[PDB]
Amino acid sequence: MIIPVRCFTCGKIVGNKWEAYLGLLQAEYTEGDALDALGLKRYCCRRMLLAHVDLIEKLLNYAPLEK
Amino acid sequence: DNKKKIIITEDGEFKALQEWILETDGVSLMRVLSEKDVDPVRTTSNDIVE
Amino acid sequence: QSLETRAEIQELAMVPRMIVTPQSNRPVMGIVQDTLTAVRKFTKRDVFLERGEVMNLLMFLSTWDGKVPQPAILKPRPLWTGKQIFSLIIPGHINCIRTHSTHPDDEDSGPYKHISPGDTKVVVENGELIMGILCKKSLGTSAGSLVHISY
Amino acid sequence: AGILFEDIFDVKDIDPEGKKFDRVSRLHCESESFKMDLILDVNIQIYPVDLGDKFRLVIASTLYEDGTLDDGEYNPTDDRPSRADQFEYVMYGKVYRIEGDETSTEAATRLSAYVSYGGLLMRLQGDANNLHGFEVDSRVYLLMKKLA
Amino acid sequence: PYANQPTVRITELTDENVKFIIENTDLAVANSIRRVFIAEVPIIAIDWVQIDANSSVLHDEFIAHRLGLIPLISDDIVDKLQYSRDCTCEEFCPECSVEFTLDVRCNEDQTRHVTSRDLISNSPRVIPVTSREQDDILIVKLRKGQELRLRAYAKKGFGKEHAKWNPTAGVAFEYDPDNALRHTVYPKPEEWPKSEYSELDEDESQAPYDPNGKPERFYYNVESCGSLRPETIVLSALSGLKKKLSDLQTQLSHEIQSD
Amino acid sequence: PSNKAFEKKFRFDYTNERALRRTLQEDLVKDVLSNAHIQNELEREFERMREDREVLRVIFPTGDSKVVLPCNLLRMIWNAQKIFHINPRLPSDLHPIKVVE
Amino acid sequence: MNAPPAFESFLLFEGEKKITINKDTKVPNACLFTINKEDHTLGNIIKSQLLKDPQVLFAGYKVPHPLEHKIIIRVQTTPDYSPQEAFTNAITDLISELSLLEERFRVAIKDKQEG
Amino acid sequence: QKRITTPYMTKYERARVLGTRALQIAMCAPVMVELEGETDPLLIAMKELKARKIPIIIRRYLPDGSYEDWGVDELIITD
Numbered sequence: 014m015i016i017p018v019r020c021f022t023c024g025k026i027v028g029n030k031w032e033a034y035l036g037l038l039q040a041e042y043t044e045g046d047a048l049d050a051l052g053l054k055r056y057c058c059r060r061m062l063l064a065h066v067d068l069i070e071k072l073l074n075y076a077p078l079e080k
Numbered sequence: 081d082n083k084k085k086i087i088i089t090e091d092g093e094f095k096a097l098q099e100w101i102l103e104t105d106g107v108s109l110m111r112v113l114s115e116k117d118v119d120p121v122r123t124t125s126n127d128i129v130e
Numbered sequence: 131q132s133l134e135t136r137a138e139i140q141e142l143a144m145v146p147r148m149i150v151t152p153q154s155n156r157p158v159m160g161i162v163q164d165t166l167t168a169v170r171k172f173t174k175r176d177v178f179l180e181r182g183e184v185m186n187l188l189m190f191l192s193t194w195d196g197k198v199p200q201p202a203i204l205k206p207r208p209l210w211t212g213k214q215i216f217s218l219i220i221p222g223h224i225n226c227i228r229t230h231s232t233h234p235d236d237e238d239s240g241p242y243k244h245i246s247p248g249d250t251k252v253v254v255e256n257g258e259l260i261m262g263i264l265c266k267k268s269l270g271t272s273a274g275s276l277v278h279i280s281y
Numbered sequence: 282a283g284i285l286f287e288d289i290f291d292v293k294d295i296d297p298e299g300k301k302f303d304r305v306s307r308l309h310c311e312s313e314s315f316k317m318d319l320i321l322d323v324n325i326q327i328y329p330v331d332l333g334d335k336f337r338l339v340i341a342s343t344l345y346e347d348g349t350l351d352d353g354e355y356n357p358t359d360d361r362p363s364r365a366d367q368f369e370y371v372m373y374g375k376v377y378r379i380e381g382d383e384t385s386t387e388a389a390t391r392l393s394a395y396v397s398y399g400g401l402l403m404r405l406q407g408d409a410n411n412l413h414g415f416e417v418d419s420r421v422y423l424l425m426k427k428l429a
Numbered sequence: 430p431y432a433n434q435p436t437v438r439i440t441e442l443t444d445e446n447v448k449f450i451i452e453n454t455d456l457a458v459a460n461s462i463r464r465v466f467i468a469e470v471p472i473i474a475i476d477w478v479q480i481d482a483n484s485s486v487l488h489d490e491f492i493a494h495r496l497g498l499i500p501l502i503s504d505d506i507v508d509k510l511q512y513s514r515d516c517t518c519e520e521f522c523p524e525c526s527v528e529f530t531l532d533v534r535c536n537e538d539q540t541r542h543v544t545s546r547d548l549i550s551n552s553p554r555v556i557p558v559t560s561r562e563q564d565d566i567l568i569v570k571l572r573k574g575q576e577l578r579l580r581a582y583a584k585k586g587f588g589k590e591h592a593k594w595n596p597t598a599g600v601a602f603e604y605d606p607d608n609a610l611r612h613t614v615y616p617k618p619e620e621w622p623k624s625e626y627s628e629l630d631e632d633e634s635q636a637p638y639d640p641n642g643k644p645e646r647f648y649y650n651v652e653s654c655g656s657l658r659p660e661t662i663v664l665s666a667l668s669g670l671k672k673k674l675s676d677l678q679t680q681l682s683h684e685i686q687s688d
Numbered sequence: 689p690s691n692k693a694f695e696k697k698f699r700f701d702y703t704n705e706r707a708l709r710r711t712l713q714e715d716l717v718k719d720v721l722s723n724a725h726i727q728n729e730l731e732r733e734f735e736r737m738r739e740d741r742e743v744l745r746v747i748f749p750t751g752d753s754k755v756v757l758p759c760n761l762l763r764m765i766w767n768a769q770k771i772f773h774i775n776p777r778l779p780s781d782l783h784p785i786k787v788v789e
Numbered sequence: 790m791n792a793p794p795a796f797e798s799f800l801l802f803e804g805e806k807k808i809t810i811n812k813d814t815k816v817p818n819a820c821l822f823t824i825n826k827e828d829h830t831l832g833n834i835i836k837s838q839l840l841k842d843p844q845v846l847f848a849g850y851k852v853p854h855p856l857e858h859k860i861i862i863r864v865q866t867t868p869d870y871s872p873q874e875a876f877t878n879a880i881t882d883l884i885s886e887l888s889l890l891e892e893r894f895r896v897a898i899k900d901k902q903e904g
Numbered sequence: 905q906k907r908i909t910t911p912y913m914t915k916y917e918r919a920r921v922l923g924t925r926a927l928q929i930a931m932c933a934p935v936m937v938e939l940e941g942e943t944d945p946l947l948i949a950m951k952e953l954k955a956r957k958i959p960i961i962i963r964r965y966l967p968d969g970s971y972e973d974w975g976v977d978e979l980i981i982t983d
């Protein structure tokens with residue numbers, strides 16, 4: 014759906030790293046490089062960004078029920 | 081030991097003897113028991129009706 | 131739903147009253163899953179408990195008289211043993227003899243019969259664990275186990 | 282007082298057939314005076330011992346020279362002269378077996394006392410005249426002391 | 430029979446985390462301090478949410494949940510606040526809560542990112558963690574024509590109630606880096622990598638056993654979520670535990686003197 | 689057990705002075721040796737034991753003695769030893785005729 | 790629908806008492822302390838401080854059930870020393886120990902900043 | 905007049921007697937023992953059983969059709 018606000022295990026704020034992570038992946042940083050470029054050292058926090066899937070974009074593709 | 085023949089010696093022991101036994105595939109308990117040299121006391125058949 | 135049937139269930143079908151089954155004159159309940167494994171590791175010969183760890187474990191005994199036993203080792207520092215505490219768990223004055231799962235067969239024939247190098251003959255005497263390692267064969271549902279004799 | 286046994290032993294061997302436990306080991310030791318055998322299980326972590334070492338045993342029914350039959354209860358606070366103050370390694374167990382060389386007619390010549398300290402076993406095997414005060418289901422202290 | 434004197438020295442101080450060492454104290458005291466860090470330091474987070482309109486693609490409880498997890502900079506206000514259960518005021522007042530508002534509507538054809546910057550607070554000091562290049566916490570994405578309006582209130586609470594009141598991100602805790610007390614037993618000590626705080630040569634795998642040792646030199650690394658400063662988390666935790674023990678002391682003294 | 693071993697284990701052999709004096713008090717060894725009524729009763733008890741042995745062998749052609757019975761006699765004996773502090777090193781006090789009667 | 794409220798773990802209802810004292814009848818100079826709405830955070834530090842007292846024969850703590858929120862502390866003392874004063878002495882030493890630690894910590898943090 | 909039944913209370917008889925006496929105590933029947941402040945009829949019934957004061961007799965029906973009447977006090981309580 015959308016990026017979680019906090020890491021489930023650690024509790025570190027990970028909700029503001031998604032847009033930066035995507036931007037770095039555009040620039041040929043690899044994931045192993047982009048993740049620690051953002052300051053995510055514990056693998057519990059790293060798996061959040063690494064395994065997240067963003068379905069909010071597919072939902073926004075549909076027309077709203079209102080206007 | 082329960083299929084092996086068990087006797088009692090002169091010193092009151094229970095030595096397990098080993099003797100030949102024959103298992104069959106049919107059942108005709110009467111014509112078998114009434115035969116020479118077959119042991120008529122222990123010969124069982126697994127068929128209750130017979 | 132009624133007082134008569136309530137009393138009858140209490141006096142006939144309570145769990146503690148159903149420990150031994152008449153099907154095979156063995157106990158039905160037994161120590162199982164991670165207590166059994168933790169008991170075998172806890173009652174081994176080389177298990178020593180400091181004073182604080184013993185005082186915590188005794189805090190979980192319901193049938194304890196409030197008397198701390200004399201430690202098996204006094205002077206270099208006071209150390210208890212797993213057997214020394216499991217003896218406090220055993221109730222009354224129970225006496226039974228069991229063999230561990232890994233007990234070699236030749237051990238009984240030769241010397242060291244009553245002083246087992248492998249700690250593999252369970253001997254409980256006067257309600258106190260003297261020697262041996264408790265396994266499924268000692269606390270399980272087999273006939274003659276420590277719970278069967280206790281019942 | 283009360284001293285069930287007193288002698289100086291020498292470690293003739295450490296656990297044969299390998300060690301089965303990493304903290305405790307079995308040692309076989311002999312005697313100089315009484316010429317009797319001991320098999321003792323000891324924890325090496327707090328009291329390490331090596332082959333060929335020489336030590337003194339004092340098996341006693343109590344830790345007091347007064348010979349007052351103590352509680353079997355653990356009391357840390359006691360301002361009494363303890364027999365263990367002069368000793369390094371002190372255990373506490375109960376004798377659970379006494380085997381003999383006796384027969385139907387003649388008495389026992391060689392005795393073997395088995396005593397367990399919380400699961401640590403000891404077999405003391407000598408002549409009947411030395412293992413005299415050992416009685417089954419009795420509480421004893423092994424007081425050991427290593428000496429040069 | 431008396432208290433021992435412990436000592437502290439800080440090896441790293443940052444706006445993000447404090448790393449320090451405590452000497453000459455019990456294991457239990459160290460563990461309890463580690464425990465109070467996570468559970469029993471008061472902090473401010475939004476707990477009451479009233480939604481006036483929500484045309485987004487996430488349902489009302491999904492947005493209220495995400496809102497709850499947004500950290501708020503509460504450094505000195507949290508001390509002078511009161512628990513909502515303790516305030517004698519009938520309705521929300523400035524002395525027991527902080528009010529937030531959010532009115533965002535997407536009109537242009539570009540996707541609108543509703544982030545924490547859109548939360549308008551009532552107090553100039555209690556604001557989201559993006560106070561002072563980095564982006565901000567993303568709440569929701571809105572398509573053209575969608576909107577959401579909501580009014581929220583922040584209260585004081587600690588971790589024991591809910592994890593949103595947890596001030597710390599990660600509390601690393603260690604003692605006895607080289608296995609001297611041997612509270613843990615390695616079947617093969619060679620395979621185990623050295624700790625950061627270990628002091629051994631490349632050859633030696635673990636320290637020699639000493640039977641007389643006790644756990645000392647506890648190593649802490651307290652990393653903040655951004656709501657409280659890393660250094661003030663520890664001061665608040667120590668004060669809270671001392672106050673907790675003091676309340677128990679008063680209640681026991683009252684009970685004994687009445688007994 | 690063997691015919692030689694069965695007899696060795698369950699006869700009351702009352703013709704040995706020292707052997708009997710090893711296990712029994714002094715007030716009882718003289719009674720066993722002197723009184724012939726007691727000796728006759730003991731011989732009769734062994735004859736009953738021999739008869740029971742013959743009956744068991746005909747009941748159980750299978751060698752195994754493992755059986756299922758109401759209350760564990762060996763465990764009760766062990767319990768009695770530990771309750772009364774028997775100390776099986778001194779001569780016994782129980783009169784052998786009290787056992788039979 | 791059966792989930793208890795979150796604040797159930799630390800809030801006392803009306804009529805409940807924080808700490809209750811019951812004398813132990815099995816052995817002399819023994820006592821049991823029941824603390825409501827507490828967990829290991831408080832029981833463990835109290836027990837460890839008590840074990841330092843030379844005049845305390847026994848000290849232990851337990852939580853009867855994790856779903857319940859109660860602690861039980863058993864204190865046995867040598868006969869010249871009440872368990873109640875042993876408990877209060879442990880508390881008043883732990884408080885002093887924590888206050889000293891906080892003061893040293895704040896001094897160290899001040900010295901870390903340009904010191 | 906002659907009694908060939910066991911002199912012990914079977915478990916079933918013990919269960920039914922306790923239940924059916926606790927029911928009478930529930931209905932304001934007089935109590936046979938000096939109870940000590942307890943309020944539960946089952947505890948009171950268990951006390952009257954152990955004190956051997958239950959005013960109930962048991963009619964054991966033999967297979968032939970005859971029957972024997974045993975007072976609660978006349979037979980040994982198994983527990």
Ligand SMILES: [Zn+2]
Binds near residue numbers: 022023024056057059
């Ligand atoms: Zn994490």
Ligand SMILES: [Zn+2]
Binds near residue numbers: 517521523
């Ligand atoms: Zn207010």
